[PDB]
From a paper:
If the HK incorporates a REC domain (REC-1) is denoted as hybrid histidine kinase (hHK), and the first His-Asp phosphotransfer event occurs in the same polypeptide chain. Then, HPt protein containing a phosphorylatable His shuffles the phosphoryl group from the phosphorylatable Asp in the REC-1 domain to the phosphorylatable Asp in the REC domain of an RR (REC-2) in two more phosphotransfer steps. In fungi, the HPt accepts the phosphoryl group from REC-1 domains of various hHKs upstream of the signaling pathway and forwards it downstream to REC-2 domains present in at least two conserved RRs, Ssk1 and Skn7. Also, we have obtained the crystal structures of Ct_HPt alone and in complex with REChHK6 bound to the phosphomimetic BeF3−, as well as the crystal structures of REChHK3 and RECCa_Sln1.
The structure of the complex REChHK6-BeF3−:Ct_HPt comprised one molecule of each protein in the asymmetric unit (AU) and had an interface area of 835 Å2. The REChHK6 showed the β5α5 organization typical of REC domains connected by five loops β–α. However, loop β4–α4 seemed highly mobile with scarce electron density and side chains could not be traced. The phosphomimetic BeF3− was stabilized in the active center by interactions with the phosphorylatable D1221 (distance between Be and O atoms is 1.76 Å), residue K1271, a water molecule, and a Mg2+ ion, but surprisingly, it was not bound to the conserved T1249 at the end of β4. Also, the phosphomimetic maintained a distance of 3.3 Å (between Be and N3 atoms) from the phosphorylatable H105. Meanwhile, the Mg2+ ion was stabilized by additional interactions with the phosphorylatable D1221, residue D1172 in loop β1–α1, the main chain carbonyl oxygen of Q1223 and two water molecules. Meanwhile, the Ct_HPt structure, following the nomenclature of Sc_Ypd1, consisted of a bundle of helices formed by five helices named αA (residues 52–61), αB (residues 70–93), αC (residues 97–114), αD (residues 117–131), and αE (comprises 143–172), locating the phosphorylatable H105 in αC. The majority of contacts involved α1 and loop β1–α1 in REChHK6 interacting with αB and αC in Ct_HPt that were supported by peripheral contacts between loop β3–α3 and loop β4–α4 interacting with αC and αD, as well as between loop β5–α5 interacting with αA and αC. Interestingly, in REChHK6-BeF, the OLeu-NAsp+1 distance between Leu in β4 (L1248) and phosphorylatable D + 1 in β3 is much shorter (~3.6 Å) and Leu had not changed the rotamer impairing the Leu-Thr switch and the reorientation of conserved Thr in β4 (T1249) and Phe in β5 (F1268) towards the active center. In our complex structure, we have trapped a transition state where phosphorylated REChHK6 is bound to Ct_HPt just before phosphotransfer takes place, similarly as observed in the complex structure of RECSc_Sln1-BeF:Sc_Ypd130.
Residue numbers in the entry:
A (entry chain A): 1163 to 1284
B (entry chain B): 44 to 173
Amino acid sequence: GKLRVLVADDNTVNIEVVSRLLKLESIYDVTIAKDGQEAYELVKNAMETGERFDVIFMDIQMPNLDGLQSTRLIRALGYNAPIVALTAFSEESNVKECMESGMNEFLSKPIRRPALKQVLAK
Amino acid sequence: PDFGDHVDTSIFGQILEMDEGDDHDFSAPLVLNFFEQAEETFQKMETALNNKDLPELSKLGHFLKGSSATLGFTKIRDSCQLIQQYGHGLNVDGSSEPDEGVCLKKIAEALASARVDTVALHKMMREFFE
Ligand code: BEF
Ligand SMILES: [Mg+2]
């Protein structure tokens, strides 16, 4: 009934926009990661405490550990739920390395309610 | 207000639709945060130019591209796209620039555009939001 969502981005502007769009979609249990190392730690903790994140939103470029590497580590942990890339496309096949890293779906900034909803439906 | 070529109204309008009211409850803090972020980012870019760290500059360019893109600040976004590419040692046409100096220089030129367009947009916004 209630979704538990993780949003990982280093940019607070994008965080607040995504958080609003999620709140509009009646999703309140939203945890924030500022980089990919935090994201890994939060998923690890979530599996350790038995609280599964139902979806993760993962920015590609972040300090300490980027989104591609964080995702690979997350899959390595055995987290098997969807991961959605938050991207600022400078290329088209950037998705291939993303999918190779373990990401499932793709949102390009600017992120809006129509596209987020389509992702959540599936 | 009249923003000009500084704002894509369609994209920025979608941000205003995320307000619960006409009081700009969401929009005004968000755009205020962006300007704090923009100034800090510009300062980190200057350090990186000083340290001549093209990779760091590429990440900083991309960082601010996403926030400027979400708010519809096209001029800042495009300058940020240029800083991202030149930081990868890439020209506009996609060729590699072996000359680090040229990359450094052109990043500075794009950063100058961004600082000017940021000041211009800061006024337009400070008015409109009041
Ligand atoms: F920093 Be992310 F790839 F927008
Ligand atoms: Mg980022």
